[PDB]
Amino acid sequence: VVPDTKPSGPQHTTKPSILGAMEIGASSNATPESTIETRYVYNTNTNAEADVEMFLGRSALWGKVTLTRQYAKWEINFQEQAHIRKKFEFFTYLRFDMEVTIVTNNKGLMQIMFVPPGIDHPETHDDRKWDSASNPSVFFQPKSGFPRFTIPFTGLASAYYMFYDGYDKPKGSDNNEYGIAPTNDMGLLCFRTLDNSGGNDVKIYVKPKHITAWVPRPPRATQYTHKYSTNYHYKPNSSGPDEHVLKDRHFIKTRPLISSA
């Protein structure tokens, strides 16, 4: 819980608990007992809804796909949906198992093949690569059930890189890849339908659990432009004769006059 408020009478002190220093890079400890006359207040609120586990552990949407010919593919990443990508880009390193739930409006009999990294996925339905011996697969009938399965932390390091300030190839190389793109791939999910019944919309809800965030950061203050790319200059009109005009798309509203708001 949060601490209670202590009483505070009139104080005439020579050590001001108000005059701090912003330059020292430390925040002030000034509680309202230092500025005014407080009363004892049994305060029992908790920030239990703010800890990383309950903050991120809510099973948001990570990606949508569309079964074209009873087949669709999705490479696991949080980079497509800005709302959850921002909550992740709060922190630098994150370590979490994830719990994938598939909300599909299809009807019939579907199959999900979690392709671990480094192998070839089925390039279409009724491919030979679907008969797999070791690639873990999930069968389900969308009516009567939502398929769900946990992927443990597949990291190749002690955490996930939300931001990576490095490359993967040495200096003189030519196809160097900035960012977190090479640092990790979580495989991919290949969906197919064995029947013909339902729609084609598949939503992948992923819930980070057993989270352990590592380095806080300034939350993203600009709308994204690409994935894995942390650009923010939006090039809105590529066709017209202004393509070289780059919007900014921030969220700082302006007020008409200071000292009047």
Binding site: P136, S137, V138
Partner: peptide, 11 residues
Amino acid sequence: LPSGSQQFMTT
């Protein structure tokens, strides 16, 4: 019956 309780996961 939570999600993940009428499914066939191979593993």
